[PDB]
Amino acid sequence: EEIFTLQVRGRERYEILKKLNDSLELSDVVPASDAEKYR
Amino acid sequence: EIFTLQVRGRERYEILKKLNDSLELSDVVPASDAEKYRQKF
Amino acid sequence: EIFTLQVRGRERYEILKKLNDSLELSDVVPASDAEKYRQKFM
Amino acid sequence: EIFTLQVRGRERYEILKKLNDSLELSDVVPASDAEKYRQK
Ligand SMILES: [Zn+2]
C-alpha cells in the first residue's frame, strides 16, 4: 500500500496523532455492520 | 463523563464525527479481534 | 449552522476541541498569510 | 522534538496532514491575530 510520512512537532501531539491513525486504520477494516454491533 | 462539542460547518462536523466515531470504536473492539481485522485486509 | 457532538471523557473532549479550533483558524487564514506566519515564527 | 509518523493510504494521510498543518498554524498565529481572523 502507498506509504506516507508526516513530521510531528512535540511528543504529546505525536501521541494524539498516532492514536488517530491507529483508530482510523481499524475503522477502515471493520465492516460498518460489525461496528454497530460492538457499539 | 460526557461533553457535547459545538461544530461550526458541515466539513468540520464530518471530520470530527469521523474521528470521534473511530476512537469510540477502538474502545469497544477487543484486542484479538482488532488484530484479526487488520490481518484479513 | 451548528452541529453538536457527544464526546466521552475530558481528555478526548479537550483534544477534539483543540482540533476544532485549529481547523476553524485554518479556514479563515489565507494560505499566503499562513506561510508568512510559518516562516517568521519557526 | 520532532517525530516521524508513518501513514498507510492516501485517505488517511490527507486527513492527518490537514490536522497536523492546522495544529502547527495555530502554534504560530498570535492569540490576538487569531481572534481577528475569526471575527473577519
Ligand atoms: Zn473475540
The grid cell for D12 is 488517511
- 8 A C-beta contact, residue C2 and residue B8: yes
- Angstrom distances, CA of residue A26 to CA of B7, B19, B24, C26, D21: 25, 12, 11, 28, 23
- How much distance in Å is there from the Cα of B30 to the middle of ligand 1? 6
Cα B22–B23–B29 angle (5° rounding)?
Answer: 85
Separation CA B29–CA B13 (nearest Å): 24
Separation CA C6–CA A3 (nearest Å): 33
Separation CA C22–CA D37 (nearest Å): 12
Cα B23–B25–B26 angle (5° rounding)?
Answer: 65
> How near does any CA of chain A get to the CA of B23, in Å?
6
Cβ-Cβ contacts under 8 Å, C38 against chain D: 24-25, 28
Nearest to C31 by CA among B12, D12, D37: D37
- Angstrom distances, CA of residue D25 to CA of A30, B19, B20: 33, 20, 22
Overall domain count for chain B: 1
Q: What was the structure determination method?
A: X-ray
Domain CATH code at residue D7: 4.10.170.10
What is the domain extent for residue A9?
1-39
- 8 A C-beta contact, residue A8 and residue D20: yes
Beta bridge partners of B8: C2
Nearest to B7 by CA among C30, D35, C24, D24: C24
Nearest to C16 by CA among C5, C2, C26: C5
